[PDB]
Design a protein around this nucleic acid. Structure first.
Ligand SMILES: [Mg+2]
Ligand SMILES: [Mg+2]
Ligand SMILES: [Mg+2]
Ligand SMILES: [Mg+2]
Ligand SMILES: [Mg+2]
Ligand SMILES: [Mg+2]
Ligand SMILES: [Mg+2]
Ligand SMILES: [Mg+2]
Ligand SMILES: [Mg+2]
Ligand SMILES: [Mg+2]
Ligand SMILES: [Mg+2]
Ligand SMILES: [Mg+2]
Ligand SMILES: [Mg+2]
Ligand SMILES: [Mg+2]
Ligand SMILES: [Mg+2]
Ligand SMILES: [Mg+2]
Ligand SMILES: [Mg+2]
Ligand SMILES: [Mg+2]
Ligand SMILES: [Mg+2]
Ligand SMILES: [Mg+2]
Ligand SMILES: [Mg+2]
Ligand SMILES: [Mg+2]
Ligand SMILES: [Mg+2]
Ligand SMILES: [Mg+2]
Ligand SMILES: [Mg+2]
Ligand SMILES: [Mg+2]
Ligand SMILES: [Mg+2]
Ligand SMILES: [Mg+2]
Ligand SMILES: [Mg+2]
Ligand SMILES: [Mg+2]
Ligand SMILES: [Mg+2]
Ligand SMILES: [Mg+2]
Ligand SMILES: [Mg+2]
Ligand SMILES: [Mg+2]
Ligand SMILES: [Mg+2]
Ligand SMILES: [Mg+2]
Ligand SMILES: [Mg+2]
Ligand SMILES: [Mg+2]
Ligand SMILES: [Mg+2]
Ligand SMILES: [Mg+2]
Ligand SMILES: [Mg+2]
Ligand SMILES: [Mg+2]
Ligand SMILES: [Mg+2]
Ligand SMILES: [Mg+2]
Ligand SMILES: [Mg+2]
Ligand SMILES: [Mg+2]
Ligand SMILES: [Mg+2]
Ligand SMILES: [Mg+2]
Ligand SMILES: [Mg+2]
Ligand SMILES: [Mg+2]
Ligand SMILES: [Mg+2]
Ligand SMILES: [Mg+2]
Ligand SMILES: [Mg+2]
Ligand SMILES: [Mg+2]
Ligand SMILES: [Mg+2]
Ligand SMILES: [Mg+2]
Ligand SMILES: [Mg+2]
Ligand SMILES: [Mg+2]
Ligand SMILES: [Mg+2]
Ligand SMILES: [Mg+2]
Ligand SMILES: [Mg+2]
Ligand SMILES: [Mg+2]
Ligand SMILES: [Mg+2]
Ligand SMILES: [Mg+2]
Ligand SMILES: [Mg+2]
Ligand SMILES: [Mg+2]
Ligand SMILES: [Mg+2]
Ligand SMILES: [Mg+2]
Ligand SMILES: [Mg+2]
Ligand SMILES: [Mg+2]
Ligand SMILES: [Mg+2]
Ligand SMILES: [Mg+2]
Ligand SMILES: [Mg+2]
Ligand SMILES: [Mg+2]
Ligand SMILES: [Mg+2]
Ligand SMILES: [Mg+2]
Ligand SMILES: [Mg+2]
Ligand SMILES: [Mg+2]
Ligand SMILES: [Mg+2]
Ligand SMILES: [Mg+2]
Ligand SMILES: [Mg+2]
Ligand SMILES: [Mg+2]
Ligand SMILES: [Mg+2]
Ligand SMILES: [Mg+2]
Ligand SMILES: [Mg+2]
Ligand SMILES: [Mg+2]
Ligand SMILES: [Mg+2]
Ligand SMILES: [Mg+2]
Ligand SMILES: [Mg+2]
Ligand SMILES: [Mg+2]
Ligand SMILES: [Mg+2]
Ligand SMILES: [Mg+2]
Ligand SMILES: [Mg+2]
Ligand SMILES: [Mg+2]
Ligand SMILES: [Mg+2]
Ligand SMILES: [Mg+2]
Ligand SMILES: [Mg+2]
Ligand SMILES: [Mg+2]
Ligand SMILES: [Mg+2]
Ligand SMILES: [Mg+2]
Ligand SMILES: [Mg+2]
Ligand SMILES: [Mg+2]
Ligand SMILES: [Mg+2]
Ligand SMILES: [Mg+2]
Ligand SMILES: [Mg+2]
Ligand SMILES: [Mg+2]
Ligand SMILES: [Mg+2]
Ligand SMILES: [Mg+2]
Ligand SMILES: [Mg+2]
Ligand SMILES: [Mg+2]
Ligand SMILES: [Mg+2]
Ligand SMILES: [Mg+2]
Ligand SMILES: [Mg+2]
Ligand SMILES: [Mg+2]
Ligand SMILES: [Mg+2]
Ligand SMILES: [Mg+2]
Ligand SMILES: [Mg+2]
Ligand SMILES: [Mg+2]
Ligand SMILES: [Mg+2]
Ligand SMILES: [Mg+2]
Ligand SMILES: [Mg+2]
Ligand SMILES: [Mg+2]
Ligand SMILES: [Mg+2]
Ligand SMILES: [Mg+2]
Ligand SMILES: [Mg+2]
Ligand SMILES: [Mg+2]
Ligand SMILES: [Mg+2]
Ligand SMILES: [Mg+2]
Ligand SMILES: [Mg+2]
Ligand SMILES: [Mg+2]
Ligand SMILES: [Mg+2]
Ligand SMILES: [Mg+2]
Ligand SMILES: [Mg+2]
Ligand SMILES: [Mg+2]
Ligand SMILES: [Mg+2]
Ligand SMILES: [Mg+2]
Ligand SMILES: [Mg+2]
Ligand SMILES: [Mg+2]
Ligand SMILES: [Mg+2]
Ligand SMILES: [Mg+2]
Ligand SMILES: [Mg+2]
Ligand SMILES: [Mg+2]
Ligand SMILES: [Mg+2]
Ligand SMILES: [Mg+2]
Ligand SMILES: [Mg+2]
Ligand SMILES: [Mg+2]
Ligand SMILES: [Mg+2]
Ligand SMILES: [Mg+2]
Ligand SMILES: [Mg+2]
Ligand SMILES: [Mg+2]
Ligand SMILES: [Mg+2]
Ligand SMILES: [Mg+2]
Ligand SMILES: [Mg+2]
Ligand SMILES: [Mg+2]
Ligand SMILES: [Mg+2]
Ligand SMILES: [Mg+2]
Ligand SMILES: [Mg+2]
Ligand SMILES: [Mg+2]
Ligand SMILES: [Mg+2]
Ligand SMILES: [Mg+2]
Ligand SMILES: [Mg+2]
Ligand SMILES: [Mg+2]
Ligand SMILES: [Mg+2]
Ligand SMILES: [Mg+2]
Ligand SMILES: [Mg+2]
Ligand SMILES: [Mg+2]
Ligand SMILES: [Mg+2]
Ligand SMILES: [Mg+2]
Ligand SMILES: [Mg+2]
Ligand SMILES: [Mg+2]
Ligand SMILES: [Mg+2]
Ligand SMILES: [Mg+2]
Ligand SMILES: [Mg+2]
Ligand SMILES: [Mg+2]
Ligand SMILES: [Mg+2]
Ligand SMILES: [Mg+2]
Ligand SMILES: [Mg+2]
Ligand SMILES: [Mg+2]
Ligand SMILES: [Mg+2]
Ligand SMILES: [Mg+2]
Ligand SMILES: [Mg+2]
Ligand SMILES: [Mg+2]
Ligand SMILES: [Mg+2]
Ligand SMILES: [Mg+2]
Ligand SMILES: [Mg+2]
Ligand SMILES: [Mg+2]
Ligand SMILES: [Mg+2]
Ligand SMILES: [Mg+2]
Ligand SMILES: [Mg+2]
Ligand SMILES: [Mg+2]
Ligand SMILES: [Mg+2]
Ligand SMILES: [Mg+2]
Ligand SMILES: [Mg+2]
Ligand SMILES: [Mg+2]
Ligand SMILES: [Mg+2]
Ligand SMILES: [Mg+2]
Ligand SMILES: [Mg+2]
Ligand SMILES: [Mg+2]
Ligand SMILES: [Mg+2]
Ligand SMILES: [Mg+2]
Ligand SMILES: [Mg+2]
Ligand SMILES: [Mg+2]
Ligand SMILES: [Mg+2]
Ligand SMILES: [Mg+2]
Ligand SMILES: [Mg+2]
Ligand SMILES: [Mg+2]
Ligand SMILES: [Mg+2]
Ligand SMILES: [Mg+2]
Ligand SMILES: [Mg+2]
Ligand SMILES: [Mg+2]
Ligand SMILES: [Mg+2]
Ligand SMILES: [Mg+2]
Ligand SMILES: [Mg+2]
Ligand SMILES: [Mg+2]
Ligand SMILES: [Mg+2]
Ligand SMILES: [Mg+2]
Ligand SMILES: [Mg+2]
Ligand SMILES: [Mg+2]
Ligand SMILES: [Mg+2]
Ligand SMILES: [Mg+2]
Ligand SMILES: [Mg+2]
Ligand SMILES: [Mg+2]
Ligand SMILES: [Mg+2]
Ligand SMILES: [Mg+2]
Ligand SMILES: [Mg+2]
Ligand SMILES: [Mg+2]
Ligand SMILES: [Mg+2]
Ligand SMILES: [Mg+2]
Ligand SMILES: [Mg+2]
Ligand SMILES: [Mg+2]
Ligand SMILES: [Mg+2]
Ligand SMILES: [Mg+2]
Ligand SMILES: [Mg+2]
Ligand SMILES: [Mg+2]
Ligand SMILES: [Mg+2]
Ligand SMILES: [Mg+2]
Ligand SMILES: [Mg+2]
Ligand SMILES: [Mg+2]
Ligand SMILES: [Mg+2]
Ligand SMILES: [Mg+2]
Ligand SMILES: [Mg+2]
Ligand SMILES: [Mg+2]
Ligand SMILES: [Mg+2]
Ligand SMILES: [Mg+2]
Ligand SMILES: [Mg+2]
Ligand SMILES: [Mg+2]
Ligand SMILES: [Mg+2]
Ligand SMILES: [Mg+2]
Ligand SMILES: [Mg+2]
Ligand SMILES: [Mg+2]
Ligand SMILES: [Mg+2]
Ligand SMILES: [Mg+2]
Ligand SMILES: [Mg+2]
Ligand SMILES: [Mg+2]
Ligand SMILES: [Mg+2]
Ligand SMILES: [Mg+2]
Ligand SMILES: [Mg+2]
Ligand SMILES: [Mg+2]
Ligand SMILES: [Mg+2]
Ligand SMILES: [Mg+2]
Ligand SMILES: [Mg+2]
Ligand SMILES: [Mg+2]
Ligand SMILES: [Mg+2]
Ligand SMILES: [Mg+2]
Ligand SMILES: [Mg+2]
Lengths: 275, 48
RNA sequence: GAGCUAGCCCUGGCCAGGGUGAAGCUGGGGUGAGACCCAGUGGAGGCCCGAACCGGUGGGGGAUGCAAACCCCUCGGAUGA
RNA sequence: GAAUGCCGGCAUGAGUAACGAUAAAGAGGGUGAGAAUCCCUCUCGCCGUAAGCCCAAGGGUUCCUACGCAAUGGUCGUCAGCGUAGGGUUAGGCGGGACCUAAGGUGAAGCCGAAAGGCGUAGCCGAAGGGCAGCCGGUUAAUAUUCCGGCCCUUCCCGCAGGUGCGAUGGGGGGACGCUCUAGGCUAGGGGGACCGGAGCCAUGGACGAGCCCGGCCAGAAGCGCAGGGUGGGAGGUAGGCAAAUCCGCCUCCCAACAAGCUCUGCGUGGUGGGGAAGCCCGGGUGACAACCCCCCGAAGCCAGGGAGCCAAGAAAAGCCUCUAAGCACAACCUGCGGGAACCCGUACCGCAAACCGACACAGGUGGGCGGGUGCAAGAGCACUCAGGCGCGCGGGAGAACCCUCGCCAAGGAACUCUGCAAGUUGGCCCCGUAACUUCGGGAGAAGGGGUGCUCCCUGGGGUGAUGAGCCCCGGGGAGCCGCAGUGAACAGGCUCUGGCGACUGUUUACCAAAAACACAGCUCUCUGCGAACUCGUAAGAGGAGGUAUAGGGAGCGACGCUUGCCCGGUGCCGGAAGGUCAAGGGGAGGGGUGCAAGCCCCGAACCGAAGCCCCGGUGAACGGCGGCCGUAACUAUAACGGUCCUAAGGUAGCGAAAUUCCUUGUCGGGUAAGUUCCGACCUGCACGAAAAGCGUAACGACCGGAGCGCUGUCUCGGCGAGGGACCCGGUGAAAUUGAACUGGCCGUGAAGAUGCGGCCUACCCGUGGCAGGACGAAAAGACCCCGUGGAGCUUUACUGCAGCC
RNA sequence: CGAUGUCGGCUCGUCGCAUCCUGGGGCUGAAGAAGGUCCCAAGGGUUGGGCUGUUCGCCCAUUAAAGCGGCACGCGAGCUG
RNA sequence: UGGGAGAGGGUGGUGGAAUUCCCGGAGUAGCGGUGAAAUGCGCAGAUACCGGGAGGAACGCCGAUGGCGAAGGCAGCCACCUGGUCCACCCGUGACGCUGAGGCGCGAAAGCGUGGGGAGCAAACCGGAUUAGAUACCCGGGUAGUCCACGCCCUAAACG
RNA sequence: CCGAGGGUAGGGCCCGUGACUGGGGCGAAGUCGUAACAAGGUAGCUGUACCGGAAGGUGCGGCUGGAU
């Protein structure tokens, strides 16, 4: 449930904020944080390589457990659910009966106080992680590894999930958040349930200022530039595109497919995304 | 108004100094040239 | 050559005073319960007025200048991109 | 002899402009060869959220003293930031280093690159961040938290005593963090005192007074007191914190819990050490055996790592503590005490400026802290003023034009002009009151209006006390007094109606454009399955992102509302295992050169052979496109209707003489006495139209139009006044420009606009203040225009390549 | 073309006369009054305002009249812009 | 108090048939469609047939002249939560009743907002026919929508 | 002091009027088609939505006041 404001400024009229209701603890675990070194979109040569980035709020990185198969059989109690400035999902503090503490991304419906566990023998319940091959066909899942032991790569954003569609030998067939149909190795771990904070996508930033807080600097149109700068630059007065709509670097930007043709994963992708 | 020269001793030594010049192929060519010309100062004076 | 200027990164600092009075909370009313209304509390905001500070709107002056962009009057922002 | 030639010298302009803020001067005394300019005294003015004080940069002896005045100083100079010389900067505790880490830089391992070199986890370097022990006073011409004095403290070494499983670059805790708002108690700072100390004063009509004037503190170990910060205790289990662990984490049990206790800090007190005014006496003496007390105000500072709320979710590492490992347990460490030891660099001076950046002793620029008092609602605003600092390094006269900045103006009141440009008006606070429209917030300080000083009387709450007096704060009600006027000075919105554009706050052409341009929340298309796409790089490596389709890139559109039609023939993109075309390569019918030969060598047909293109289809919030003619209705006019040519298809909704309309000042209506503008309409739209979005839209705008009210020197139409210049005298003294000049008018002529030629006319020689018609006046080898087989930026279905991709 | 600044306004004029007015005439289809047309005549005069950058022009209210031209379409080392 | 019937409502689950699409197989010259046609689809292998998968919507027979609800309306099956209603007993209360301006709530479809979902169907739209013409009827396509959640809208031949 | 009224300013209601514009009623001697009444030649009507020169069409759901 996103929170609205009365129009007591021109911006509060449209601004909405997350309600932060699932959040039970407002300070991160000190042993699980490290500084997030801001880049401003610059690489190691000092060059901008992603435009319009920088100037957002300072953030600490929360170490997230994207393995789980790390501690098979060892149950953990869900100690808290917290805010993570570095991702859209919320995060859940686990207290393992081990005494070890780690974060996972909070699934939809996860309750503080509840217990979760990882392994081939884990119950099929929200927050538990199992290799894909032991998760029942049809169950929706998240934080999916792409290759065994390489860590969760798939369905991590707020509200997302993948669905197990079937099995074929060593592999299982997933419907990814994008609607892409794909084989993923059966030994890949996944966590049952969908990622929480599903209302994330209903947030209305409301004002330019809010984008700046997030480290997103103003984006300037190619049409607003000059020919030195951009294919769309120039023209007296306003100008239509006057050529196929292009990137600053000249490649076409309406439809031109860009995934590499002879890519080895093509053997594993059953059907390209929808919509 | 604010002009272009805003003296800063660390900035000076770190930018034009002997160790900056020696670190780089171009910088050493500067020193060689300035020694060959007979410059009394190879590198900008800065007080430390 | 980025000691000017543009952007970003790290770490510090600054922003008189006054005004408006959001949510929430409490109480009262209301209802089957509610919504909701009223009062008090509260203290939000690229909110308002205005110095510092950041600007540079209109006019006047200056024009071998006080000055290779300044001066006066006036004017924009001033918790925020 | 010329090259707007080069170097140098010296002229002209010219005793001309100017001498750098309009804060301001006058006199007396001294010094001296010389004095507006140096010193001293009195008087006057200016700054005082500074034009005062302290710190950091930067500068580098400019500091202090003596002796100087050629040059420097916009004049002068006896003076000086100038010349010469001598002196001057004192630290275990202040800053930095012998500590830590941040971005970043470097870089064992390792990776990459023709060379040079590029990267790179660790480590190291890197600060104005973390961490760490000194306060007050006195002293010098010149340094002082540094010397001295008093009272405190830190680390290292060694020793003694007591205590302990000691021991680390390893484990853990902690260090450790935002923004806004904010409590309690304090301190800094300030005000008052009829109280305490003090040299003295009684003027000029009055006052010997509860008179005036001055001052009434500062630092301080332990202890104690007040206010706060930090932290639960015991046991048992243990598989996690890359070994170990008694530590930490997790589980359980038991006492404890807005407590205490333990601990740490702040403030107070505190043995003790200091300081100590006005005044008149020559920086010093006295005042003085100075006094050193009470009340009030009170931080943004302190307790602090305090509290609450919020979303955008807010460094690291060391010091420190705890745990143990090798080891070692005669050691070692811990606590106390004692003695010893304690290095390097900085320290002068300027520091919003005449010592820094601006070529200048330049009205510009320069980060942090202190920044008193009174009044004005508050305040760092404004006026005056303290401490402190200044009068801006040319002056003296005069009292024209003209210029600047300023003040006032009869009657009129926008008639000015492109335009109310400029300047008036308005102006703070309290009260009353406030429209369309609206997204219900607003519009709003709408508009408009009333009040405002002082005196006396009565009275209501609050703070500090104690519940009272006193002090301080916020009110209320009567009755009066004075002036033209009571925010009596200074600081302080003119307003309304109505269009266009852009939703809004923002951003921009540093130095001619601040805008309607950019951005912006938001909408849509599209790419991207993660070693993502995309970007930088030859690469390695990076960014993307320690992110994962609710994500990331690209593009367009630009809050919001109501919407966004038709055309897929061309171009683009997407899909299509058929077919056509298609390079290297495969293949080798057939042919050739040569040799006596086996052989060697060359050409070469069918056939097989990718992407691309062709070809089939899809696709518009992809590039884009969105007609013409003839005929027809009870008068005319027009044409719902019909016909026909063409097209890929012929512009929908909405809007329209428009930021678009040529004809055009279209026509009609409104406003005006009068309206090429403005508003409302009409529609034959030269040449609107739906995300290069269409039509609207509250609020917003130093945007651009139109109208009205208020008020004005904008104007009719100008007058007077002020100061700074202009003028004159003393001092100092430029500049561009300049073929040379003994440089008049007219009518002509002349390369077509003559001081210079002809004819005629006029004209004694030389200046000073003024005005700009000419010298085709100065400046800049025209920036328009053309020319050059000159250049550069940009584009593309120009040519040809290259990267990149297939 | 090693520069002769270009519209309009303002200011300041001065000249021509093919005369708008005022003065003097002839003819008239001149009764008078008022006109028409031509001749002489440049001494003086030739308004304020609305629109628009405008010149020009249209309009409002007047007037004896609301003249037309030249002066680098007079005048930016005079101003505006 | 004791029983009964029922598509009354809400929530969470879950079953089978069929349509479409995708994959594999097999097969060839048409299929589809209509009054008759044509557009369309199909040798780039359609239709018809078999196996696999995905997904949305609606529930055949039972089914009725049937049942339930105040009305709108409600239909596979399971469970939970919950309303109305009828009967028998004649046990309790003792007129506690009827209606009902205003008010409040509910209210088919279409429509709207935000987000999902999208198989079939189908406004608008495109094409083929028909016809004198045919912005229709018929045919081949086709987007909203139809479905889910939440919030609106509040209409009807909302009729007996 | 109050006070007729006058003046300044801002609101509310009502009437008349207005370039132009919307539809309505009547007229009828016209143009276009023929939507309804018969199964009216697509049964009709209906709320809503979208669309078309026009009557009207189509979608979704509803009614019978539908012929066979
Ligand atoms: Mg929630
Ligand atoms: Mg709300
Ligand atoms: Mg809101
Ligand atoms: Mg709110
Ligand atoms: Mg708004
Ligand atoms: Mg919230
Ligand atoms: Mg939450
Ligand atoms: Mg925090
Ligand atoms: Mg850490
Ligand atoms: Mg990180
Ligand atoms: Mg990073
Ligand atoms: Mg680097
Ligand atoms: Mg680099
Ligand atoms: Mg980029
Ligand atoms: Mg960037
Ligand atoms: Mg989060
Ligand atoms: Mg969120
Ligand atoms: Mg959004
Ligand atoms: Mg952020
Ligand atoms: Mg963005
Ligand atoms: Mg943009
Ligand atoms: Mg541009
Ligand atoms: Mg460039
Ligand atoms: Mg280009
Ligand atoms: Mg272009
Ligand atoms: Mg163009
Ligand atoms: Mg352009
Ligand atoms: Mg254009
Ligand atoms: Mg442009
Ligand atoms: Mg443009
Ligand atoms: Mg533009
Ligand atoms: Mg375009
Ligand atoms: Mg173009
Ligand atoms: Mg084009
Ligand atoms: Mg590419
Ligand atoms: Mg893979
Ligand atoms: Mg600087
Ligand atoms: Mg310097
Ligand atoms: Mg430095
Ligand atoms: Mg430095
Ligand atoms: Mg530096
Ligand atoms: Mg160096
Ligand atoms: Mg030299
Ligand atoms: Mg030498
Ligand atoms: Mg050098
Ligand atoms: Mg910082
Ligand atoms: Mg900061
Ligand atoms: Mg501020
Ligand atoms: Mg209040
Ligand atoms: Mg609250
Ligand atoms: Mg503001
Ligand atoms: Mg504000
Ligand atoms: Mg404001
Ligand atoms: Mg200015
Ligand atoms: Mg002005
Ligand atoms: Mg002036
Ligand atoms: Mg200039
Ligand atoms: Mg100025
Ligand atoms: Mg000024
Ligand atoms: Mg102002
Ligand atoms: Mg302001
Ligand atoms: Mg402020
Ligand atoms: Mg702001
Ligand atoms: Mg900020
Ligand atoms: Mg010669
Ligand atoms: Mg010359
Ligand atoms: Mg010369
Ligand atoms: Mg020369
Ligand atoms: Mg020369
Ligand atoms: Mg001479
Ligand atoms: Mg002269
Ligand atoms: Mg002198
Ligand atoms: Mg002298
Ligand atoms: Mg003196
Ligand atoms: Mg003063
Ligand atoms: Mg003061
Ligand atoms: Mg210097
Ligand atoms: Mg000194
Ligand atoms: Mg000296
Ligand atoms: Mg001298
Ligand atoms: Mg001298
Ligand atoms: Mg001399
Ligand atoms: Mg000199
Ligand atoms: Mg000078
Ligand atoms: Mg002397
Ligand atoms: Mg000097
Ligand atoms: Mg000496
Ligand atoms: Mg010492
Ligand atoms: Mg040492
Ligand atoms: Mg270091
Ligand atoms: Mg440091
Ligand atoms: Mg220290
Ligand atoms: Mg001390
Ligand atoms: Mg000294
Ligand atoms: Mg932290
Ligand atoms: Mg910090
Ligand atoms: Mg802030
Ligand atoms: Mg307080
Ligand atoms: Mg004190
Ligand atoms: Mg005070
Ligand atoms: Mg007397
Ligand atoms: Mg206390
Ligand atoms: Mg253990
Ligand atoms: Mg004393
Ligand atoms: Mg004594
Ligand atoms: Mg005494
Ligand atoms: Mg403050
Ligand atoms: Mg958030
Ligand atoms: Mg670190
Ligand atoms: Mg051992
Ligand atoms: Mg111990
Ligand atoms: Mg040493
Ligand atoms: Mg010193
Ligand atoms: Mg200054
Ligand atoms: Mg310079
Ligand atoms: Mg000076
Ligand atoms: Mg200066
Ligand atoms: Mg003070
Ligand atoms: Mg005031
Ligand atoms: Mg005030
Ligand atoms: Mg001020
Ligand atoms: Mg004072
Ligand atoms: Mg002076
Ligand atoms: Mg004179
Ligand atoms: Mg002045
Ligand atoms: Mg007057
Ligand atoms: Mg007026
Ligand atoms: Mg008036
Ligand atoms: Mg105007
Ligand atoms: Mg005022
Ligand atoms: Mg109104
Ligand atoms: Mg309202
Ligand atoms: Mg608002
Ligand atoms: Mg007012
Ligand atoms: Mg208004
Ligand atoms: Mg008085
Ligand atoms: Mg006065
Ligand atoms: Mg003033
Ligand atoms: Mg104001
Ligand atoms: Mg005005
Ligand atoms: Mg208005
Ligand atoms: Mg607009
Ligand atoms: Mg704007
Ligand atoms: Mg704009
Ligand atoms: Mg808008
Ligand atoms: Mg916008
Ligand atoms: Mg804006
Ligand atoms: Mg602002
Ligand atoms: Mg410029
Ligand atoms: Mg500019
Ligand atoms: Mg420039
Ligand atoms: Mg420029
Ligand atoms: Mg300007
Ligand atoms: Mg500009
Ligand atoms: Mg502006
Ligand atoms: Mg721009
Ligand atoms: Mg824009
Ligand atoms: Mg939009
Ligand atoms: Mg590249
Ligand atoms: Mg890499
Ligand atoms: Mg990365
Ligand atoms: Mg990364
Ligand atoms: Mg990402
Ligand atoms: Mg934009
Ligand atoms: Mg609206
Ligand atoms: Mg097309
Ligand atoms: Mg096409
Ligand atoms: Mg077609
Ligand atoms: Mg093309
Ligand atoms: Mg293709
Ligand atoms: Mg075939
Ligand atoms: Mg052969
Ligand atoms: Mg042969
Ligand atoms: Mg091919
Ligand atoms: Mg579309
Ligand atoms: Mg085309
Ligand atoms: Mg286009
Ligand atoms: Mg006819
Ligand atoms: Mg058109
Ligand atoms: Mg159409
Ligand atoms: Mg028109
Ligand atoms: Mg228009
Ligand atoms: Mg047009
Ligand atoms: Mg034209
Ligand atoms: Mg026109
Ligand atoms: Mg025109
Ligand atoms: Mg007209
Ligand atoms: Mg106009
Ligand atoms: Mg105009
Ligand atoms: Mg017309
Ligand atoms: Mg465009
Ligand atoms: Mg446009
Ligand atoms: Mg368009
Ligand atoms: Mg519009
Ligand atoms: Mg604006
Ligand atoms: Mg503006
Ligand atoms: Mg005047
Ligand atoms: Mg005067
Ligand atoms: Mg005067
Ligand atoms: Mg004067
Ligand atoms: Mg004067
Ligand atoms: Mg004289
Ligand atoms: Mg001569
Ligand atoms: Mg001549
Ligand atoms: Mg001549
Ligand atoms: Mg002559
Ligand atoms: Mg001669
Ligand atoms: Mg001759
Ligand atoms: Mg002659
Ligand atoms: Mg003559
Ligand atoms: Mg002249
Ligand atoms: Mg001449
Ligand atoms: Mg001339
Ligand atoms: Mg001339
Ligand atoms: Mg020039
Ligand atoms: Mg030139
Ligand atoms: Mg040249
Ligand atoms: Mg030339
Ligand atoms: Mg030229
Ligand atoms: Mg130019
Ligand atoms: Mg030419
Ligand atoms: Mg040529
Ligand atoms: Mg040639
Ligand atoms: Mg070129
Ligand atoms: Mg020329
Ligand atoms: Mg010349
Ligand atoms: Mg010239
Ligand atoms: Mg007669
Ligand atoms: Mg005659
Ligand atoms: Mg005359
Ligand atoms: Mg004359
Ligand atoms: Mg005119
Ligand atoms: Mg005209
Ligand atoms: Mg006309
Ligand atoms: Mg008359
Ligand atoms: Mg003329
Ligand atoms: Mg001409
Ligand atoms: Mg002409
Ligand atoms: Mg002219
Ligand atoms: Mg003229
Ligand atoms: Mg002229
Ligand atoms: Mg000029
Ligand atoms: Mg002119
Ligand atoms: Mg001239
Ligand atoms: Mg002139
Ligand atoms: Mg001239
Ligand atoms: Mg002008
Ligand atoms: Mg202009
Ligand atoms: Mg049935
Ligand atoms: Mg029934
Ligand atoms: Mg009974
Ligand atoms: Mg309904
Ligand atoms: Mg619907
Ligand atoms: Mg579909
Ligand atoms: Mg037809
Ligand atoms: Mg639609
Ligand atoms: Mg829709
Ligand atoms: Mg009267
Ligand atoms: Mg019909
Ligand atoms: Mg019919
Ligand atoms: Mg029919
Ligand atoms: Mg229509
Ligand atoms: Mg038609
Ligand atoms: Mg239809
Ligand atoms: Mg019904």
């Amino acid at each position: 449930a996103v929170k609205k404001f009365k129009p007591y400024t021109p911006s509060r009229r449209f601004m909405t904020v997350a309600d932060f209701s699932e959040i039970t603890k407002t300070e991160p675990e000190k042993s699980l944080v490290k500084p997030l070194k801001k880049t401003g979109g610059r690489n190691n040569q000092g060059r901008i390589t992603v435009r319009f980035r920088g100037g957002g709020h300072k953030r600490l990185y929360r170490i997230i457990d994207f393995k789980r198969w790390d501690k098979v059989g060892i149950p953990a109690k869900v100690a808290a659910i917290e805010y993570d400035p570095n991702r859209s999902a919320r995060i859940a503090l686990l207290h393992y009966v081990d005494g070890e503490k780690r974060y996972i991304i909070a699934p939809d419906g996860l309750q503080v106080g509840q217990q979760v566990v990882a392994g081939p023998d884990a119950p099929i319940q929200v927050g538990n992680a199992l290799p894909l091959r032991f998760i029942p066909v049809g169950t929706v899942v998240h934080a999916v590894e792409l290759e065994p032991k390489k860590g969760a790569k798939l369905a991590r954003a707020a509200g997302t999930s993948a669905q197990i569609q079937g099995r074929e030998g060593d592999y299982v067939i997933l419907r990814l958040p994008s609607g892409e149909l794909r084989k993923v190795h059966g030994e890949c771990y996944a966590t049952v349930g969908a990622v929480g904070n599903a209302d994330h996508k209903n947030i209305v930033l409301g004002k330019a200022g809010r984008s700046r807080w997030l480290g997103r600097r103003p984006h300037v149109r190619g049409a607003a530039m000059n020919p030195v700068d951009h294919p769309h630059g120039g023209g007296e007065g306003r100008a239509p595109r006057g050529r196929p709509p292009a990137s600053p670097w000249g490649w076409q930007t309406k439809g031109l497919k860009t995934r590499k043709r002879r890519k080895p994963s093509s053997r594993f992708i059953i059907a390209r995304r929808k919509k | 108004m604010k002009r272009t020269w805003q003296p800063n001793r660390r900035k000076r030594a770190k930018t034009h100094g002997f160790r900056a010049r020696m670190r780089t192929p171009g910088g050493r060519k500067v020193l060689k040239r300035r020694r060959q010309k007979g410059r009394w100062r190879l590198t900008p004076a800065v007080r430390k």
